[PDB]
Amino acid sequence: AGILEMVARGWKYFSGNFYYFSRTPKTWYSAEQFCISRKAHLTSVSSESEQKFLYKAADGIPHWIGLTKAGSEGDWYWVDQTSFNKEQSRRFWIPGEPNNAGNNEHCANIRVSALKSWNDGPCDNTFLFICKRPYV
Amino acid sequence: AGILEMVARGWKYFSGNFYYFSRTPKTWYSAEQFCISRKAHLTSVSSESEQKFLYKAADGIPHWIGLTKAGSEGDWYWVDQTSFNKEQSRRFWIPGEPNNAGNNEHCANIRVSALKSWNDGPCDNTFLFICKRPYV
Amino acid sequence: AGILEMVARGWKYFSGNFYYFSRTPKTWYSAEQFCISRKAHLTSVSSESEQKFLYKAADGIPHWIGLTKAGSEGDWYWVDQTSFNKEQSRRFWIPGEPNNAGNNEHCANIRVSALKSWNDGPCDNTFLFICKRPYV
Ligand SMILES: OC[C@H]1O[C@@H](O)[C@H](O)[C@@H](O)[C@@H]1O
Ligand SMILES: OC[C@H]1O[C@@H](O)[C@H](O)[C@@H](O)[C@@H]1O
Ligand SMILES: OC[C@H]1O[C@@H](O)[C@H](O)[C@@H](O)[C@@H]1O
Ligand SMILES: [Ca+2]
Ligand SMILES: [Ca+2]
Ligand SMILES: [Ca+2]
């Protein structure tokens, strides 16, 4: 269905995508499994515009997003398979991040309500999360 | 008011009805009293289409619906007074349900995010709940 | 942006204003600081119509509104700077209120889901809150 139908089912809408901001917290993988069941994936962030929408909408509560490493010693990528713009990302990480604390932080969340808000954390940490699916 | 006004007050909309998914948990009766104050009743489920909308929207959190027995030794009915389709219902109960545990389970909730998701429980159990009112 | 865009970002809409009903509780000042960051202020209540919308939408959970005293021994005013109609207000206070308990209740909240629902409380009490911003 369309914008009205999705918005009237609880989805947010912004720049050609719908977003589901979860009620309850999950691990990164359990979140992604839930998003898949809603025909979605944990959100990518493919513009500063989208970053601004998302950090504002997350209300200062940490939220898992769809950035994860390709294995525990791998490079970051978006689980929805859109291209990961490394250089753009420096504008979105909290100062000092990603810092791979304990060598065990392989997923990312929007930690605070700021443009510089991404932190890497243990994927088994439980947070609210953001699903994204395209407006088609 | 209309769809936009109801959606912009927090109501969901689907197939000619509005739905209010509660913030906080109540007993079955306290939920129904709240729904009445919002010109609604605890939701009926009168199609597989509606069941699908509701279990999806309930996000895997148990939610009271408007099915209750006519007294503690009575037959199931919908509190909004729409006809209860016994045979259709077998498609919506969790396997084993209704099981009338302790002979004291006289109200029903959508317990999980599946098509087979209804469980009978004690009406004094406190859960989130779903109000329904027609789009007129 | 317009009604659809605001509603699709979580804002409620009623009689020419948008409203943000918070996820988490804050002190009165921390709430107001958050509302300002969302181009809003803690809500004023400038009609019985608006009072009805707000108490209904607050779902029986106490919510901070934008009424505060001009200093701890001052008169009530709306932080968004709309005129405070003293005489109208008597229709909206809970019976007995405002009672300035402990001589330390200098902010107001909608405490219950009724037309007579405002209570003065300590501004350092933590409640959910309501931001308002005009539809322009
Ligand atoms: O909460 C303590 C935090 O320290 C930060 O600087 C790290 O980057 C986080 O991953 C860690 O959670
Ligand atoms: O949580 C224990 C549960 O056992 C189930 O099989 C019953 O049908 C429920 O009513 C009960 O709550
Ligand atoms: O909860 C106890 C309450 O007593 C009321 O009558 C006061 O007006 C409140 O400000 C106070 O919180
Ligand atoms: Ca980190
Ligand atoms: Ca049962
Ligand atoms: Ca008081």
B123 lines ligand 2 (CB under 6 A): no
A78: amino acid identity, one letter = W
Minimal-distance CA residue of chain C relative to B37: C56
- Beta-carbon count within 10 A of B3 CB: 13
- Beta-carbon count within 10 A of A116 CB: 16
Q: Could you tell me which of C41, C10, C63 has the C-alpha nearest to residue A61?
A: C10
Helices (H), C44-84: 48-57
Which residues 65-124 of chain B have a CB within 8 Å of chain A?
A: 113
Minimal-distance CA residue of chain B relative to A21: B59
Q: For residue C93, what are its two tokens?
A: 């206070």
SS3 A59: coil
Instruction: Characterize C61-94 residue by residue with b for buried, 16 or more Cβ atoms within 10 angstroms of its Cβ, and e for exposed.
Output: bbbbbbbbbeeeeeebbbbbeeeeeeeebeebbb
* Nearest-angstrom CA–CA distance, A8 and C25: 25
Tell me which H or E stretch contains C18: strand C17-21
Q: For residue B3, what are its two tokens?
A: 């769809």
Instruction: Characterize B5-24 residue by residue with b for buried, 16 or more Cβ atoms within 10 angstroms of its Cβ, and e for exposed.
Output: ebbbbbbbbbeebbbbbbee
Q: Could you tell me which of C124, C135, C127 has the C-alpha nearest to residue C14?
A: C135
- Count of residues in chain C: 136
- Enumerate helices (H) and strands (E) in chain A, giving the number of each: 4, 8
User: Which value in Å is the resolution of this experimental model?
Assistant: 1.7
Q: What are the structural domains of chain C?
A: 1-136 (3.10.100.10)
Q: Hey, which bits of A37-122 come out as E strands?
A: 41-42, 63-69, 76-78, 107-110, 118-121
Tell me which H or E stretch contains C114: none
Minimal-distance CA residue of chain C relative to A11: C8
Q: For residue B5, list chain C residues with Cβ-Cβ distance below 8 A.
A: 13
* Nearest-angstrom CA–CA distance, B67 and C58: 27
Those residues with Cβ within 8 angstroms of residue C134's Cβ, 6 or more apart along the chain or in another chain: C16, C17, C18
* Nearest-angstrom CA–CA distance, A8 and B11: 7
SS3 content of chain C, % helix, strand, coil (to 5): 25, 30, 50
Q: Which of C57, C60, C61 sits opposite B9 (nearest CB)?
A: C57
* Nearest-angstrom CA–CA distance, A95 and A75: 19
Q: For residue C38, list chain A residues with Cβ-Cβ distance below 8 A.
A: 56
Q: What is the 3-state secondary structure (H, E, C) of chain B?
A: CCHHHHHCCCCEEECCEEEEECCCCECHHHHHHHHHHCCCEECCCCCHHHHHHHHHHCCCCCEEEEEEECCCCCCEEECCCCCCCHHHHCCCECCCCCCCHHHCCCEEEECCCCCCCEEEECCCCCEEEEEEEECC
B46 lines ligand 2 (CB under 6 A): no
* Nearest-angstrom CA–CA distance, A36 and A84: 20
Q: Which of B12, B59, B61 sits opposite A8 (nearest CB)?
A: B12
- Residues C10, A12: C-beta atoms closer than 8 Å: yes
Q: For residue B53, what are its two tokens?
A: 């909308």
| Residue C12 Cα to chain centre, angstroms | 14
* Nearest-angstrom CA–CA distance, B126 and B34: 13
Q: For residue A29, what are its two tokens?
A: 């993988």
